[PDB]
Amino acid sequence: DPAKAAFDSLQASATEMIGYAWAMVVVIVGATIGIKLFKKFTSKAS
Amino acid sequence: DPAKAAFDSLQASATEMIGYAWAMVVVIVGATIGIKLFKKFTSKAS
Amino acid sequence: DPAKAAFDSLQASATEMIGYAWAMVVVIVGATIGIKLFKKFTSKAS
Amino acid sequence: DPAKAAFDSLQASATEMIGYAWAMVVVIVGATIGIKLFKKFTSKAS
Amino acid sequence: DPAKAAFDSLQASATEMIGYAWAMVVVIVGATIGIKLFKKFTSKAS
Amino acid sequence: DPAKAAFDSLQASATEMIGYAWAMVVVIVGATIGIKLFKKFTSKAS
Amino acid sequence: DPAKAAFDSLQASATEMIGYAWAMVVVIVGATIGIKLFKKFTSKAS
Amino acid sequence: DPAKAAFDSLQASATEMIGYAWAMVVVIVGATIGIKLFKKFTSKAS
Amino acid sequence: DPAKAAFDSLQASATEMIGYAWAMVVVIVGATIGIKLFKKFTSKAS
Amino acid sequence: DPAKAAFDSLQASATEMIGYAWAMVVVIVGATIGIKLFKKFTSKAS
Amino acid sequence: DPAKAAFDSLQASATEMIGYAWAMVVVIVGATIGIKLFKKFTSKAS
Amino acid sequence: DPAKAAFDSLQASATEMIGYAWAMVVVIVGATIGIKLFKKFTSKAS
Amino acid sequence: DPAKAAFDSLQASATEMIGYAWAMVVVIVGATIGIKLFKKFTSKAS
Amino acid sequence: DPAKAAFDSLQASATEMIGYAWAMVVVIVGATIGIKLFKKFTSKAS
Amino acid sequence: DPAKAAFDSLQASATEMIGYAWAMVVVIVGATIGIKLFKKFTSKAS
């Protein structure tokens, strides 16, 4: 069955991209939250 | 009746593909919603 | 009348095929609408 | 009538999904409002 | 006139399906608007 | 002239069918537009 | 002219729905503004 | 020339329908913009 | 040559119809684009 | 060339609508900014 | 070769229309972006 | 029977072409879906 | 063999037309994509 | 077998075009995401 | 190969537009951030 194999391959490609997307999100969000806390704690400290 | 058998076969093939489609959708949607909640809760928490 | 009998048989065959077609349509459309609602409600819920 | 039965089934499936969506919404919103009040009352108390 | 009768029947079938479609729309839209208001009022209340 | 009469009859039959077609179109289009506006205004109102 | 009548009916249906939409908007907006002022004046008063 | 007359009639019918379409658009758009401004000014005023 | 004359006449008739077709297109397209811009600018303005 | 004339007319219609849109924007924005400054200066003055 | 000449003419007509299309786009987009910036800067300024 | 052999050969040729068609489809669809997901996940990630 | 020569000539004519078709496609598609990107980047930039 | 060779060639051409498409996508998406992050980080930084 | 050349040209056009878009963004963002800092520092200074 040609269809069975095809869908398997598609689903594997998708799984890989999702992997790459998670990596990126973690970097960008890391920095957004980083800057937010730096602004907040500096104010409270002083 | 040749037609009866033919339609049966077609309907079985279709049933199988629908199976494969559901698998894929669950993966892709899983990740979309995953990233959305991660962005949202991280913000509220901080 | 040979013609009368012939048309009757043709009309019966057609009636049967229409039956098989309805079965198939209900399956395919079932899945199309299924996936559409799953995508829509998941988004609104989150 | 094939159509009557078909629409009934579709409408039942939809009713079930709506059920699942309400469950999810209640969890997510529960937490959003939870965190908001915790932040607010802690501040006023101190 | 065979045509007159035929068109009458078609138009009756269509009228019935439109009936079933209205039922479905009312359910789906009911839930979409329901969730939207629940999200909105909960926020304003808190 | 046999032809003159024949064409007259054909043209009358056609005129009648066009009549029946207009009736049907008005029903189907009525519902399509109906549902579209219901979806649109409900959203804006809420 | 079948078209003239058809458009008239469509335009009447639309006019009615707009009526129902205005009713809903007035209720929802009434409450949103109500809560906003209650929050604001209570604070200033105390 | 049969064609000349025919095209003239078609073009007149089209001109009339365009007339009816403009009437409808003005009503629907009138209400959409109406509701949008009511929501916006009420908020700013309060 | 009978053929030469015949083709000339055909080609003239065609040229005339193309003329009538251009007139119609300009009217219909005029209105389609008209309504599209009215919808678009009204939204942006408000 | 039928096309040249057609595009000219379309472009003139568009130019006119843009004119009407600018008029509206100036009114709405005038009021939004008006209310904003009234709220701001009254507070600072008192 | 009749074909060579024909394609040349078609390609020239197309080139001219593309010219007219660019003119229109520049006008419409000019205004869309114009209104967007006016709304944005007025807000920031005040 | 010359006919029996002939139909067998035709049916074999067809079976082979279907094979080649499946190969091509899998490549083209692979890329279409690939690009679609790349566009979608990149947006959500950022 | 008269047939051999004939097919050769036909195949040459076809090859030439395909050449002219490619030229045209490149112009039309050039403009379609051009306008699409102009609309997209102008929006993002502003 | 003429068909076998033909399909092979088609599939090779397609493979090459897909190559060129990927190149273009990477450029366009590169810039879209670039501008988005520049807008976002500049705001948070200031 | 006509396709190879075509894609090259498209990709060059795109590269140029991206250039123009970056220029615009730098101007608009320059001013937005400019005004924001002027408002902020003036307040803190006084």
Residue numbers in the entry:
A (entry chain BBB), B (entry chain BaB), C (entry chain BbB), D (entry chain AAA), E (entry chain AaA), F (entry chain AbA), ...: 5 to 50
Q: What did the paper state?
A:
Most extensively studied in this group are the F-specific filamentous phages (Ffs) that include viruses f1, fd and M13. Ffs are also strikingly simple—their single-stranded DNA genome encodes just 11 proteins, of which 5 form the phage capsid. pVIII is the major capsid protein that forms the filamentous body of the phage. The tips of the filament are formed of the minor capsid proteins which occur in pairs. pIII and pVI form the leading end of the infecting phage, which interacts with the host receptors to initiate entry, whereas pVII and pIX form the trailing end11,12.
pVIII forms the main body of the filamentous phage. It is produced initially with a signal sequence that is cleaved to leave a single α-helix of 50 residues in length, with thousands of these helices packing together in a helical array to coat the length of the phage DNA genome. The α-helices are slightly curved; with their C-termini projecting into the phage lumen, resulting in an overall highly positive charge. The N-terminus of pVIII is splayed outwards towards the exterior of the capsid. In our map, density is smeared for the four N-terminal residues, indicating that these are flexible. The helical parameters were determined using cryoSPARC and were refined to a helical twist of 37.44° and a helical rise of 16.6 Å. In the filamentous section, pVIII interacts with its neighbours by mainly hydrophobic interactions, with hydrogen bonds observed at the C-termini and mostly involving lysine residues. The positively charged lumen of the virion is comprised mainly of lysine residues from the C-terminal ends of pVIII molecules, hence allowing them to interact with the negatively charged DNA molecule. Four lysine residues from each pVIII monomer (Lys 40, 43, 44 and 48) line the DNA cavity. Overlaying a protomer of our f1-derived nanorod pVIII with a previously determined fd phage pVIII structure (2C0W; determined by X-ray fibre diffraction) shows that the two are broadly similar (RMSD of 1.0 Å across 39 pruned pairs; RMSD of 1.5 Å across all 46 pairs).
